[PDB]
Amino acid sequence: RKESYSIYVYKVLKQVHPDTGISSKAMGIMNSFVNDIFERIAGEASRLAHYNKRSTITSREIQTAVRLLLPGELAKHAVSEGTKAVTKYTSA
Amino acid sequence: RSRKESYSIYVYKVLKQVHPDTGISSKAMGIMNSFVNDIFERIAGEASRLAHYNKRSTITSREIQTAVRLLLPGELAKHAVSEGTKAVTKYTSA
Amino acid sequence: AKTRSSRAGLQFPVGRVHRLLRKGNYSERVGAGAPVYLAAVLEYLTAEILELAGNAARDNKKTRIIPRHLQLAIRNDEELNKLLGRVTIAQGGVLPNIQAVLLPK
Amino acid sequence: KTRSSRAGLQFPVGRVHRLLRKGNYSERVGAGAPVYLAAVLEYLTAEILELAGNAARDNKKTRIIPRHLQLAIRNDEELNKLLGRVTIAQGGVLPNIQAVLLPK
Amino acid sequence: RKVLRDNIQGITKPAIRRLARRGGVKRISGLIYEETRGVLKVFLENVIRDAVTYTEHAKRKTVTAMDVVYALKRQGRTLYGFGG
Amino acid sequence: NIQGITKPAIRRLARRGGVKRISGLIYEETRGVLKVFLENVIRDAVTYTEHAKRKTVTAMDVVYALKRQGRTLYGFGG
Amino acid sequence: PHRYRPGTVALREIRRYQKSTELLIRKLPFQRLVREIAQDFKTDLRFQSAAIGALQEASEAYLVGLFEDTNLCAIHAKRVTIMPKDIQLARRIRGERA
Amino acid sequence: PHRYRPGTVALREIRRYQKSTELLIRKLPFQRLVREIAQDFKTDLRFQSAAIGALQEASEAYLVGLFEDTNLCAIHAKRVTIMPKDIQLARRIRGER
DNA sequence: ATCAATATCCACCTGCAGATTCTACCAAAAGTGTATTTGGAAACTGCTCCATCAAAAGGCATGTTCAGCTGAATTCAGCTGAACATGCCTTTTGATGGAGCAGTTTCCAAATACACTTTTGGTAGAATCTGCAGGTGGATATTGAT
DNA sequence: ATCAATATCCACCTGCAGATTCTACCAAAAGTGTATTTGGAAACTGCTCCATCAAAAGGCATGTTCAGCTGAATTCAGCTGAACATGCCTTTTGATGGAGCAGTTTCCAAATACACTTTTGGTAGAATCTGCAGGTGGATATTGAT
């Protein structure tokens, strides 16, 4: 028990900075970061769906949630990555 | 078609209890509905979370009570917790 | 066929509040005392603000509570103000308040 | 054959799903929602790691610390807005001294 | 229809003056009016933006008061009185 | 105990805050503010504690308390 | 001819407007400003009358509160006249634009 | 007999402290304060070291932030010396008062 | 220390735009009789957590000096409030057409429910390493002083 | 601006210890294969509401004058807060133990979720009522000039 996002953070770290490492304390911050953004996006999508009397959170909700939460440029890229991962998942 | 619920019937009752002689304009009632819905959500919300932090799948009157203590300030809290407990113990007294 | 509200000794709708809890995705399951307790607090709070609103109405010589009356009651009660410190009441105006430095020297 | 690899992500899609279901957000959850969400979490993570990576390099360090994440965030307009109500422990503040307070 | 331009100037000096009054302000410098318009414009952009986003998400062409109300809640400016 | 929060320590905080010259009354003003801060946070934390029926305030209780006050903190479990 | 000294009427207006609750920006112009801004975001948008109503109430409530803070900033600078500088300090401390 | 002109060392401390990230409040005195305030809410509590450490980080980041706004308020008043009225003004605009 | 000049009340009036009730269904509580859990209630560990001890070391509490910053006292150019003359354009009323919310059905592509089958991520030791913390030695930044 | 004498920073190197990184293994997820449910999309369409128009009217927005008095400069000196060398003591910190207690387990009796079947409590309009928004007018200040 006591799962975290460490492994995943670290893997993403090696893609953008193979050379770079990361202290424990710094890893704790990435964890906190991921949990926070996860809850905000999640939270907003929840409300969105409720506002429209829907019982299911789809990528449609997640996207609008990203649009409402992330600032301008960061929102664009997030929406890109998002639709890209969903697009590749449905295919194969 | 398209029946839409409200708290007006209850706000109005409570109004007559406190000020028997006083009415309330619909806009003021509008304000009241927003208040009830807003507070209901904040409580339900904090409760939802309190339950989560404790691996608990159920929201009991105990969650609602601690949620009211986190949400409401001093005296309002003391008084709301009293009313709340009083109602529960009365409801359970069959 | 009693009503749960009456069993609780309340005006606010206990059943409705129990329904709104289940449909709000707050937790998997909901206790029987939760909706009762919550309808009790809701009723207490609308009672506290209608009391103060009613008095404001009386002072302005009106018999029907309007929004300005609600504002007066909220902004003048230290706790209701803190409770609704980030809320804006449509058509409620502000509290008569002029900084001293501004008054005729 | 896991969903993450299928969506081609480093982040745990399957877990993001289990979390969405158990977080009491909605009655039901789409199949692409966890995928989508997982993609967003990874991107933002890369963004910060990238900038914090540089902040580290620009300091002669190879290993990223809290300071480096704070410098990465505060020195970036968007990341900073997104986390303007967040406090990174052990990150400090950006050096900045009001002009008026300078000598002569 | 008709092109919409410079409507921010519809926020006249006297209306801004009245708002300062309710806010308790006694003396107003000449540069205040252009600043207020700037600040109001940013205020509206952010609320309308989020509002219209809620509209589009519900595949509507009509911005409802609920949309504005949700947008205001997001932005931390909860409004009572239109909750509907 | 609050006086335990010393002038030089408050000097240091102000410095990291960019403050050059400090008035002699700032120190007691700072303690009063620091105390109101901890009281609000700790009070919320200890409420989460008692709810969890514990005798030990955990870092998570403090993190959840800070989040309610709009003082979200990364680094201690969230 | 009779003449009130500068500041007397100003104070007369504060008492007046702090006593009332009516909207202080003209309706039509404001509805026109919203539609202009809304438009530069997404075209062919329609508005519920109450939506524009909710927008104005919020806007004026926001401006009125900003001016209070602005006023406090001027006073604190030992002035009585509010300046863009005050509005900017206000918004900066409000975390609306550090 | 070397001596620095008032202000010189002050700027030097700003440059130093804005560069570091170590807690500026002495730990023990702090824990003592935390447990005392707490004693007023629930009796004989125990604190995870991590919890005391979270509280300190939070408050120090809060105070530092508050000093920034205070400094701005003082400057706005054509001053260079922060005062209680500056802390008071910031906390008011912040909505904490 | 008076007054005109105006602005501010407060009480009295009266039909109507906006509440209060009065009626009727019917969506949604409440009453029953089962099929799952939920989450305490005792019993027991391994921990993290206080408590001392016990030195030592910075780090703080103190008293001097005095640099220079905050505030008080004066001035005064001209910004911004008060008043007014004009006449524009927001308000108010009502009407129309029809765009596009919303209520109903009809019902597949997609989601939830198992029952298993595999796989991965969280743990608790093992094998290096990034930097911290010092050490010079060398330009710099300061501040007194021709 | 230099001259000179402090003290400050600031590289370059360097050596160790606390962390990191790297390994070797197990339950709890996560992926599958089936078997059903069903949410809410598609296809009408009933019908509120929104966008426009027309028009008359007077509440206000505009612009211009004028000059009161406020904000921006200046000077200045008392005295508050910075820089310091001093002397001392509370905070560090590092085992050492004992122990108060989060964390698990193992039940299960009490409390919930269900699936229906009746029973009303509420919500949507008609049907009735009525505060109070404007309108007026003296009674009262409230101001600002002599």
Short mmCIF file of C-alpha atoms in Angstrom, two decimals, chain F:
data_model
loop_
_atom_site.label_atom_id
_atom_site.label_comp_id
_atom_site.label_asym_id
_atom_site.label_seq_id
_atom_site.Cartn_x
_atom_site.Cartn_y
_atom_site.Cartn_z
CA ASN F 1 6.26 30.88 23.43
CA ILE F 2 5.31 33.22 20.59
CA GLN F 3 8.05 35.55 21.79
CA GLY F 4 10.24 32.59 20.99
CA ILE F 5 9.82 33.73 17.40
CA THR F 6 12.74 36.16 17.61
CA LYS F 7 13.42 39.58 16.08
CA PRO F 8 16.39 38.34 14.02
CA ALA F 9 14.20 35.50 12.65
CA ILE F 10 11.52 38.01 11.70
CA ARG F 11 14.34 40.15 10.29
CA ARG F 12 15.29 37.21 8.08
CA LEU F 13 11.74 36.59 6.88
CA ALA F 14 11.31 40.25 5.89
CA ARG F 15 14.64 40.12 4.07
CA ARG F 16 13.61 37.14 1.93
CA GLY F 17 10.51 39.28 1.40
CA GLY F 18 12.63 42.08 -0.03
CA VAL F 19 12.32 44.38 2.99
CA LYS F 20 15.23 46.78 3.57
CA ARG F 21 14.24 48.94 6.55
CA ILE F 22 12.01 47.61 9.37
CA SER F 23 10.03 49.66 11.88
CA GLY F 24 10.41 48.76 15.55
CA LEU F 25 6.72 47.86 15.89
CA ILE F 26 6.78 45.31 13.04
CA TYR F 27 8.06 42.56 15.30
CA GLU F 28 5.04 42.45 17.60
CA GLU F 29 2.77 43.06 14.63
CA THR F 30 4.32 40.01 12.95
CA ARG F 31 3.83 37.68 15.89
CA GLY F 32 0.16 38.57 16.17
CA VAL F 33 -0.31 37.78 12.49
CA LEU F 34 1.77 34.59 12.72
CA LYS F 35 -0.33 33.50 15.65
CA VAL F 36 -3.65 34.11 13.86
CA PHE F 37 -2.24 32.06 10.96
CA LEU F 38 -1.30 29.00 13.02
CA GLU F 39 -4.52 29.15 15.03
CA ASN F 40 -6.65 28.94 11.87
CA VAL F 41 -4.57 26.20 10.33
CA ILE F 42 -3.92 24.10 13.44
CA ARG F 43 -7.57 24.33 14.43
CA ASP F 44 -8.57 22.82 11.06
CA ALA F 45 -5.84 20.20 11.24
CA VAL F 46 -6.85 19.05 14.72
CA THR F 47 -10.44 18.78 13.46
CA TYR F 48 -9.32 16.36 10.78
CA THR F 49 -7.36 14.54 13.50
CA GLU F 50 -10.26 14.10 15.92
CA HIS F 51 -12.42 13.04 13.03
CA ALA F 52 -9.91 10.31 12.21
CA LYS F 53 -10.13 9.56 15.95
CA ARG F 54 -6.38 9.99 16.40
CA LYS F 55 -4.16 11.61 19.05
CA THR F 56 -1.50 12.44 16.47
CA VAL F 57 -1.69 15.32 14.04
CA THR F 58 -0.30 13.99 10.76
CA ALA F 59 1.34 15.85 7.92
CA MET F 60 -1.76 14.98 5.87
CA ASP F 61 -4.02 16.65 8.42
CA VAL F 62 -1.93 19.81 8.01
CA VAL F 63 -1.89 19.56 4.23
CA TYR F 64 -5.66 19.19 4.04
CA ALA F 65 -6.00 22.12 6.46
CA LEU F 66 -3.76 24.29 4.37
CA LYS F 67 -5.78 23.43 1.26
CA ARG F 68 -9.02 24.59 2.93
CA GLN F 69 -7.45 27.93 3.84
CA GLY F 70 -6.27 28.36 0.25
CA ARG F 71 -2.65 27.82 1.26
CA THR F 72 -2.06 24.62 -0.76
CA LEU F 73 1.35 23.13 0.00
CA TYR F 74 3.31 20.65 -2.18
CA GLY F 75 5.87 18.30 -0.61
CA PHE F 76 4.19 16.53 2.31
CA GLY F 77 1.79 13.97 0.83
CA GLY F 78 0.03 16.52 -1.34
#
